Amino acid sequence: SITKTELDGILPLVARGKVRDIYEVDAGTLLFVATDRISAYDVIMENSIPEKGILLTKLSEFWFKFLSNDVRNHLVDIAPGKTIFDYLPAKLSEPKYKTQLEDRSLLVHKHKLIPLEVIVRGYITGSAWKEYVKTGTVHGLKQPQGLKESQEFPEPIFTPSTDENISPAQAAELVGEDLSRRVAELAVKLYSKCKDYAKEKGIIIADTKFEFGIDEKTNEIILVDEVLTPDSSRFWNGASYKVGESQDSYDKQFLRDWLTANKLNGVNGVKMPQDIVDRTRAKYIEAYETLTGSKWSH
């Protein structure tokens, strides 16, 4: 299990997120490392979910290839017969580093960021549902009357965030009108395609958060960051789906129920019991095998 990467200053650290450690390789390249950390109620647990980061890396790699004709991405193309280790300083191939990096790492090109959280909603839940119940709006957008909790929207909608939920007009003030219209259309198209694929496999992807960049020389919108994982999206079990009710989290319900049962929800320094760790990891492996069609040996 890898909880935190330690590269002994071989590469400078750009950032440490909730789950990802990002290093700078050179002037135009970054190294994204997915660790095995997990979050619930805005807190990172003290222990890990073994191989979570490997599973989530491979799932994002699957989606990038699934959408390769629909949108360009930031991945550095590794030549045939080469590995990421051939594109990194030699020292990183020594056992002590190599073991922290293999299979959970992505080599990416640095791109100009579009500073917006691009959320696409196919189903009504979370803060969107709460807002709707009060004023009949979603990120200030007027909606049809009579939608039931967890119901599918007629057509998936772009509902940006900066964080704080904003309307599409506010996003046009932040990044420009043309740009915000182009990202909204692309995001919706991408989400619909994947949602439909996943739904045939038994997984309902209720919403997702995309991050985009722009290649200002070609003027292309580029798919960046993590794509359609249980950490950037709301995954629901298609089998238990019922409109008018709240849905369990595909991956995190076991953890969440244990926490609230013990009044540890939102508390720092909490170690999950082994049984929660194991049941949690088995769900990631099921998501991975079911969506990729690949088998996880261990």
UniProtKB/Swiss-Prot annotation:
GO terms for cellular component: cytoplasm; nucleus. The keyword Transmembrane helix does not apply. It is an enzyme of class 6 (ligase). GO terms for molecular function: ATP binding; phosphoribosylaminoimidazolesuccinocarboxamide synthase activity. Its EC number is 6.3.2.6. HAMAP family: SAICAR_synth. Belongs to the SAICAR synthetase family. Monomer. This is Phosphoribosylaminoimidazole-succinocarboxamide synthase. It comes from Saccharomyces cerevisiae (strain ATCC 204508 / S288c) (Baker's yeast). The gene is ADE1.
